[PDB]
Amino acid sequence: LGSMKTERWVVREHVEGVPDAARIYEKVETELNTRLGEEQMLLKTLYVSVDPYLQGICLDTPIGDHMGADSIMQVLDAGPNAPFRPGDLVQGFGGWRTHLVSDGKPKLWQTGTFPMVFPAYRKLDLRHYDDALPLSTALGVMGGPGMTAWGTMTKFMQVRPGDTVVVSGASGMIGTLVGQMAKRAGARVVGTAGSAGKARYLSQLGFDAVIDYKLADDADKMREALREAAPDGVDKYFDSIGGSVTDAVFSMLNVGSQVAVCWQWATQVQRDYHGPRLLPYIMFPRATIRGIFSLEWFTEQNWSALHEELGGLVRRQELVAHETVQDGFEHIPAAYQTLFSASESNRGKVLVRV
Amino acid sequence: LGSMKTERWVVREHVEGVPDAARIYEKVETELNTRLGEEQMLLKTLYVSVDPYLQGICLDTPIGDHMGADSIMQVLDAGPNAPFRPGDLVQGFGGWRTHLVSDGKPKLWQTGTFPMVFPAYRKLDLRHYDDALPLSTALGVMGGPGMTAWGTMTKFMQVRPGDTVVVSGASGMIGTLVGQMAKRAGARVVGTAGSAGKARYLSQLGFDAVIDYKLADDADKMREALREAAPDGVDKYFDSIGGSVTDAVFSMLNVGSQVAVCWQWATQVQRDYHGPRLLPYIMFPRATIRGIFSLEWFTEQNWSALHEELGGLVRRQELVAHETVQDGFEHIPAAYQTLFSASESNRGKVLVRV
């Protein structure tokens, strides 16, 4: 009973290290079959997310396939057993496509290095959103990024007044949310950043020290910087970088410290695959290291708690949660490219309104 | 009077790596002042522990000082304010000495790579020991090694029926305790060993599979050996070895897995300080890694619970805790040397009865 033309950004070439998006991605026109199975729905993309972790998804994405990503979609149509009905707004891993057919169920990431199952699509309730907390925050402080930061700080890390908290990769939205929440819990907060502008932004956000990870050239330099920045050692480490900065942090962990491992930029992007062994350092401190994969927290109860507990703080300017919303489906790969550019006009979460 | 002669093994030389006990240590006669402060007491060594972790204590020991070690001692004489009366049996870090004077209080290991505090001497009660659990077990299944295994399995690791549990260094006392406890909890248990007699020993103790690292250093032979022994991935890892075994285990961690890091033979003894980055492997499984330092559990309540739970299991022939007791104060560095030798017919805790 039907088809429609759509556009997709597909993976044309696997390129290691820092992405060249113009070479990796190609925009194609794709005829989408619109006849829905029983549980299927036809969705229209409204916003897509661009995130540094897409660098790894992309390398694991079969050539010719669309680029997966977090997105906000609108149900255009729905078969008889669909979880949502036309007009519903939903958040799921819809990707860099203007339109798609999906049943919304959890779905195994077959070609992944780790056999991940993307979560079932979730329904957005528009009453949560207005001009101080727009719908796009469902891909940011009210979505994946916010759930990652809020989940780590309320379900694993137990920040206590007087703790020293280090946040690597603090310039991105997840780490700025973590530093701020840690500051709110009485902690001294040490961040890392890639430029002096980023460094200045973090301190105006409440970070007590900001190490320029340009020094990563020398572990000893980095360790010195950290020792000075954290003269009493490190109680909590929120890690998005790995590499020489995490090496340094593990040499100065205090007793009972907690390390949350969220991403490893230096290994994934910069190909740092070999280095000092870190497990010898956690023994005497009785440190706890936990991998973060915040899809495990995608439950109705958590989205309610996240909205009540965090939405208030954002709306009343207690929590800074910045978004850079770019325009147009054709500009998705360019907006993604800005994430890896040292030249930084990117405050917080970069998104694309389609 | 007011004096007595003693013997002491003193650190004559620092040799890194596998220890050459005959060269490193030296038996000296030493005159001991038997005039005691009101809180001091004069102690006679009854048994002395030899442990692989003394290789690192030795490097921290000022040339000429006696070698520290766990021991069982008896009070020859006490001041009217000493915590223990004459005749009382006590356990503490008394060292490779026939006699010593001490107040039994917590003592900081100053030359330690980290500020460690040795615990206050504890009183041993003869009621807790019998022909199945003799006094010497206060250095073994009823001392530090038992506390480490029991503490990790009741305070951190939650083995569930059907888990696969990997135990590094499985033929030492700590690793065989953990393995048998994991089996009772319904796990499939995989151990690692150096010889075929060592692997046989582990199989006699109920380990479902044993992996030989003697022939495996290439972590690809290791990873494949591990993949065969644990075809459904690893749920719990109790690590005393580190090295390429640990690297292999981290590549096959299941969701919700737990890693207990208790020592790193490969780092401390064989000096394997560099290796592949392991933290990228813990994100998707949401693995939890914890440094184990069992001194934090030396409390009266834990000791009492250790004797109840673990001691009862041992008396009922449900847990096997083996001990190899060498005799003679002059053979202590010889008994220590067998820990690091191949051609090793050692079963469980190695001790010297003096």
JSON list of C-alpha atoms in Angstrom, two decimals, chain B residues 14 26 70 230 291 312 347 350:
[
{"chain": "B", "resi": 14, "resn": "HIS", "atom": "CA", "xyz": [67.85, -6.07, 47.98]},
{"chain": "B", "resi": 26, "resn": "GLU", "atom": "CA", "xyz": [71.32, -13.43, 57.20]},
{"chain": "B", "resi": 70, "resn": "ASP", "atom": "CA", "xyz": [53.06, -12.82, 60.30]},
{"chain": "B", "resi": 230, "resn": "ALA", "atom": "CA", "xyz": [34.83, -20.79, 30.35]},
{"chain": "B", "resi": 291, "resn": "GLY", "atom": "CA", "xyz": [41.01, -3.76, 45.41]},
{"chain": "B", "resi": 312, "resn": "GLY", "atom": "CA", "xyz": [32.81, -25.05, 61.00]},
{"chain": "B", "resi": 347, "resn": "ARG", "atom": "CA", "xyz": [50.12, -27.52, 49.42]},
{"chain": "B", "resi": 350, "resn": "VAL", "atom": "CA", "xyz": [53.62, -22.63, 54.10]}
]
